[PDB]
Amino acid sequence: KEMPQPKTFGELKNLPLLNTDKPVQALMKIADELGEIFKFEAPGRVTRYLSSQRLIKEACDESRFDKNLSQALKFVRDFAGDGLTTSWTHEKNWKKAHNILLPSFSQQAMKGYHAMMVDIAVQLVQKWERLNADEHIEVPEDMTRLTLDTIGLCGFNYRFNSFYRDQPHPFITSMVRALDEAMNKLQRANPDDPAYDENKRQFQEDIKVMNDLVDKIIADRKASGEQSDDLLTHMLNGKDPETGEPLDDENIRYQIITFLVAGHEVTSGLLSFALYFLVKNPHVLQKAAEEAARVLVDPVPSYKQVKQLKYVGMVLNEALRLWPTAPAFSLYAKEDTVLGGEYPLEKGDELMVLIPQLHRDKTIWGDDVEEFRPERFENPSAIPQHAFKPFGNGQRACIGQQFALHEATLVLGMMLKHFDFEDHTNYELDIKETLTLKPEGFVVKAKSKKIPLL
Numbered sequence: 001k002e003m004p005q006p007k008t009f010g011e012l013k014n015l016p017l018l019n020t021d022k023p024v025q026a027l028m029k030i031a032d033e034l035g036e037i038f039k040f041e042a043p044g045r046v047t048r049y050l051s052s053q054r055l056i057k058e059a060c061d062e063s064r065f066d067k068n069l070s071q072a073l074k075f076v077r078d079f080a081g082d083g084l085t086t087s088w089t090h091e092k093n094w095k096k097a098h099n100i101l102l103p104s105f106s107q108q109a110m111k112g113y114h115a116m117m118v119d120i121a122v123q124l125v126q127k128w129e130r131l132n133a134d135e136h137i138e139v140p141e142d143m144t145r146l147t148l149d150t151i152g153l154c155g156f157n158y159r160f161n162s163f164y165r166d167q168p169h170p171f172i173t174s175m176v177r178a179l180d181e182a183m184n185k186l187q188r189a190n191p192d193d194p195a196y197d198e199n200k201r202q203f204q205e206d207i208k209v210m211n212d213l214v215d216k217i218i219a220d221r222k223a224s225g226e227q228s229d230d231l232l233t234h235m236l237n238g239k240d241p242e243t244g245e246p247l248d249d250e251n252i253r254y255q256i257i258t259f260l261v262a263g264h265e266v267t268s269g270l271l272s273f274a275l276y277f278l279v280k281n282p283h284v285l286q287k288a289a290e291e292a293a294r295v296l297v298d299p300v301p302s303y304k305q306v307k308q309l310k311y312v313g314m315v316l317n318e319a320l321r322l323w324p325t326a327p328a329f330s331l332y333a334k335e336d337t338v339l340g341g342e343y344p345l346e347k348g349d350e351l352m353v354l355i356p357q358l359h360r361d362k363t364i365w366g367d368d369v370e371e372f373r374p375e376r377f378e379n380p381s382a383i384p385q386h387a388f389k390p391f392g393n394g395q396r397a398c399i400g401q402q403f404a405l406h407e408a409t410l411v412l413g414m415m416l417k418h419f420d421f422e423d424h425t426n427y428e429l430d431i432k433e434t435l436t437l438k439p440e441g442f443v444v445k446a447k448s449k450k451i452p453l454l
């Protein structure tokens, strides 16, 4: 089969289609038009966007395909270095860091982080308890305060104190601006044009800011000798069972930057979308609120109670189905192979997995794919293989999946226990795209149920 291709712009091929405010949603519309696979060409680049479970289940075969760094990840590597997400699988630092960090990210390690996650979750609840009657909540803004603070505390015992300020932390200003520059280079038809020279100068200054601030955090911890149960201690003390080597200080810095990128808007996007879908689906909200009240019987949730918030876990998975906040990942063929029995690929050929479109495959989910129905996730054995991939695939899957879902389940549970919510503006969904997705301008009113935290 010859695969389709969207409209072209002469020598720029398909590249101008990405010069738009919402490229992921633009790619989803192209997929709707062209189907489960289409070719996408730019100067010096060819990739193929996959959207059906039929083809993606083959792409997830790790004997045939390995993780590729998309152009986006290549630009993020300019400041995330060989941290886990921007490393190639064959780089020595990928497997070393993966072996060392896996026990820090397990379901068992979440027991150790739980107290710190509660610390920040309680600050969010108290903020909302303290609003006056006429005020509202800026949802993505507050969810990002929560997730940033949680990863700072669990990551290296650092308090960003986001609920005490309007103006972001200096590290975050550079990190957000670096991510902004990474996404902007994707959309430049002529990136060598001198009008981008201070953009490039600014990008180099932001890299130096992040590096110096994180390096000081590491030097300060080594100097004090204190042993906290955070990711920094584990990286300073851990040894890779295979090579027997610890991480070096440069790589630890890259891992910290990587966790901070991941724990910022990618996780807060999930909480924002989940609350959006709950207020748009009051019957689902009521069921989740009933579970929260039945399970969260103590003033602050325990680790074990968060594990019992099963329906809230389903709400979060259904929010990830519709708007996965890391919406794509890239693969390359390790050898010549045939995809779906119709599309021959040569060694090195690249694939993009378009996750939001995969998650709308009507042959998997039925006709009602656009509806928010957490009950789809009652039994993971009833979901076909590779139909649901919001955390990536295989050995390159998200190491932070348990962390993100524990944090999100805890805080959504507390939110549902402590407040009734009003969609007071009848908010129209507007998905702002960076390298992640979020519902821009989403606002609600939260009326306290006046249940104490003591």
Ligand code: HEM
Pocket (backbone or CB within 6 Å): 067, 084, 085, 086, 098, 151, 258, 259, 262, 263, 266, 267, 270, 324, 325, 326, 328, 329, 330, 389, 390, 391, 392, 393, 395, 396, 397, 398, 399, 400, 401, 403, 404
């Ligand atoms: C809802 C929240 C999150 C989602 C949807 C998400 C999604 C993803 C996805 C799709 C990948 C694979 C990327 C690729 O194949 O190119 C990935 C990898 C990764 N994520 Fe997450 N993530 C989330 C939260 C987090 C958190 C909270 C952390 C750490 C604190 C984290 C750390 C990582 C790392 C280190 C990798 C690379 C793992 C490796 O390649 O060995 N993520 N994530």
Ligand SMILES: O=C(CCCCCn1ccnc1)N[C@@H](Cc1ccccc1)C(=O)O
Pocket (backbone or CB within 6 Å): 018, 024, 027, 040, 041, 042, 045, 047, 070, 071, 072, 073, 186, 325, 326, 327, 328, 329, 352, 435, 436
């Ligand atoms: O399709 C995408 C969407 C974004 C994927 C990477 C962003 N993200 C998501 C989760 N974690 C990182 N990105 C391609 C775009 C592109 C295609 C062809 C030529 C140039 C650019 C890429 O970045 O290579």
